[PDB]
Amino acid sequence: PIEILPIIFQRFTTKELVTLSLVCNKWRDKILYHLDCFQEFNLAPINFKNFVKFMDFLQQNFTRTYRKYILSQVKVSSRITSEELRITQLLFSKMPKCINIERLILSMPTLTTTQIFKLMVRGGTDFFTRLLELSLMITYRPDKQHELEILQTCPLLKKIELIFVNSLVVIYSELEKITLICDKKKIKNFPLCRALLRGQFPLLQKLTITGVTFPMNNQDIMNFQWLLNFPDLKELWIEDNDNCELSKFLQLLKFSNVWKNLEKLTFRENKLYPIVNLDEDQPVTNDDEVPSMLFYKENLQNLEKLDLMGTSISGSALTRLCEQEYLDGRKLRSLNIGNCPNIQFPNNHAHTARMILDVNAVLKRLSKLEEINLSHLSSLNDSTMKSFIINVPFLENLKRLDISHNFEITGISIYEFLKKFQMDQPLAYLNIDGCSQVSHITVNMIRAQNLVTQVDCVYERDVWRKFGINSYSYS
């Protein structure tokens, strides 16, 4: 009976089903005849002769007169640098017109953006105007600007991911998610800068820009003036873009009601810029006039996730975000301030006072948060951890803790923190990978006493930035 057969098939990958065609001629027909079920093609990596036969399989089987079928996910990547060109050429030349690719992950690093555009245009298999999502791990080039022409060519495109692995030399209401990941070594420019500053992208829910170099010559770019163009921006991730600064970003947050809602923010400058402090200075135009309204609260009120890893933010700046209640504290549920050198704790004796993070004030403000990340924070010595011990009652919602890659924190602080936490029913998760001072017997006692449900102790794991999971800075 035909009704059951998609239900059998769809629990099995396209490749596995295509191999399952060889069980017998009857089942060959059963599988081959249900075109709709092959909703993914994870071909990557593939050689050209194999790709020719895949395309031939489309030309034989999928090429129905009636215009029905579409594909939810096509992933193409060449096994060979030259065959990259041949595969892309054949793809845009021979894809059956009646059948539409919904989402295209065309992972072709040698291809220039110009060649991609030209191949779409002369190929004429116009699904590329009609696909829903596009991802291009490709070579950049600065002169032709054709990476903008892609969007203008593909008005149905909602999610775009440009991954500029290499370099060589208007309203966009459709767009909902933009990812721009750039190899910081190679991409010595900002590819979408003119488009981002001139155009508007009103539907845009998420933006994710990493590795680009903000040009010095245009202060409007450095002052995030373009960033005003995207209201309703539920998530903002911005990382390792060398010439950006949190300092300028917080001016934009000061002087405009730039967003009605951010659910999440993730700002990560790479180098140690000068000490940034929350600029609570509220000037008046004249004493006989009103002050400027400081829009920090209405911008930042909505945040569920605040990530500021490495951003040189001073501890007092973060306390002022809490005391002013610019951060709501109830809406906020996860916080990352790892690698921030300008964070000191009240138990320390050698600092300027404005670098102190009053964890008691802060934890009293934002108490119901679920996840904390203080990874790489050398300043979190064992003495400073005593602040967390005495502040356990103000963090009882915490499930997931990352303090990994800290070369100071002894297992002593881990044990007394967890013993005090256990006075709340263990902690769900703890990350102490790369920490040199977390004694083996201590962590094994932690497991044996079951003080943490899961604790990670890969001493040999040198790095924290799991690509795609923890960071979008490229490789």
């Binding site: 991802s135 490229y474 490789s475």
Partner: peptide, 21 residues
């Protein structure tokens, strides 16, 4: 979605370069 793996490039005397200025 994937972190890169390196592969050795190679250069040879292409006709385009032979027809450069």
């Amino acid at each position: 979605a994937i972190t890169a793996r390196k592969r050795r490039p190679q250069v040879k005397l292409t006709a385009e370069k032979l027809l450069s200025d």
